[PDB]
Amino acid sequence: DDWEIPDGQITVGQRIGSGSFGTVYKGKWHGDVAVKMLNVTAPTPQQLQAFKNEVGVLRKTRHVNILLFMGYSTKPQLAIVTQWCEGSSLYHHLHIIETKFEMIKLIDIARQTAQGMDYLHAKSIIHRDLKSNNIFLHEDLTVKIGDFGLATVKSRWSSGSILWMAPEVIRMQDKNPYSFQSDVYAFGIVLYELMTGQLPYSNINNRDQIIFMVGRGYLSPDLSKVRSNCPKAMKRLMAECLKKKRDERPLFPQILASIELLARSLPK
Ligand SMILES: CCCS(=O)(=O)Nc1ccc(F)c(C(=O)Nc2cnc3n[nH]c(OC)c3c2)c1F
């Protein structure tokens, strides 16, 4: 049963992981691994059980598009270990190395990512912070969605990502704004990243202004910066995913359907 990895087995190496939510190290354990050390100090069994609890959510995931969870650690520190993806994250491709994909690929990356979420949603998991940074890109062919773990551990132990936030999320309204449709909107944003190779609202220099405006639905993404080689009913789908009221957003089965439809409507 238990997925714990005893001390000394894992061999930590190069550093890459930033943030106060945890530090990611490249490692070696039955091959190259990724290790996210939770960068706490030494928390008390009320917290330990809460970690064990978040793992219990991860092991529910077995899907080519979901980043592979391989085991957790405790004795050196609290840790989650995953497969190591060679190649770079989606945010890196579009926004740092300016990688121009064929339109066929862009549509595919979408399909896979949508595929990944439909799964997560079927197993009652809300990603809550899907963004192109969390969409890893293996051997430059396969989509691997990460960072959906540890939702509990953010609230129990008290920036960025605002671009992906649906209105209801942005305006920090009630205690639970996070829904499936919450994630769909964040998807809509990556759809806009793919089709325009650009972050939205890049012509507004004051963050709080974005935040206020998105939350009140005064400013939404500029769909007209899609390239010409992009399909007509791609715009329609982004529009669907990006709706201000969350009811109007389609769920992933239906999104997926619309992508498969337009995907195999392109090569001819
Ligand atoms: C899979 C479910 C567990 S989770 O907590 O949702 N996500 C989760 C947990 C632990 C990790 F190390 C990671 C992670 O970012 N891994 C990771 C894996 N391979 C990489 N190649 N290049 C990178 O960047 C340079 C990588 C980063 C992760 F995304």
Annotated catalytic residue, options 129, 147, 174, 183:
129
Burial class of residue 227 (count of CB atoms within 10 Å of its CB; 0-12, 13-18, 19+): exposed
Binding residues for ATP: 16-24, 36
Matching fold, domains 1-86 and 87-268:
no
CB atoms within 10 A of CB 247: 6
Q: Which amino acid is at 224?
A: S
Cβ of 51 less than 6 Å from ligand 1: no
Cβ of 24 less than 6 Å from ligand 1: yes
Q: Which residues of 153-165 are buried (b: 16+ CB within 10 A; e: fewer)?
A: beeeeeeeebbbb
Phi/psi region, residue 213 (left: phi>0; alpha: psi -120 to 50; beta: rest), is alpha
Nearest atom (ligand 1) to Cα of 25: 12
Cβ of 148 less than 6 Å from ligand 1: yes
User: Among 14, 18, 29, 36, which is best to mutate for testing ligand 1, by the most ligand atoms less than 8 A from CB?
Assistant: 36
Closest CA to 99 of 148, 64, 140, 46: 140
Method: X-ray
Nearest atom (ligand 1) to Cα of 148: 6
Query: 190 near 247, Cβ under 8 Å?
Result: no
Topology at the third CATH level for domain 1-86: Phosphorylase Kinase; domain 1 (3.30.200)
Spacing, Cα 3 to ligand 1 middle (Å): 17
Spacing, Cα 82 to ligand 1 middle (Å): 6
Q: Where are the domains of the chain?
A: 1-86, 87-268
Residue range 87-268, CATH number: 1.10.510.10
Q: Tell me the two tokens of residue 110.
A: 């979408």
d(CA 24, CA 85): 13
147 in catalytic set: no
d(CA 197, CA 77): 38
Binding residues: 16-24, 36
What's the reported resolution, in angstroms, to a tenth? 3.3
Beta strand pairing call for 79-83 and 142-145: unpaired
d(CA 209, CA 203): 12
Spacing, Cα 62 to ligand 1 middle (Å): 15
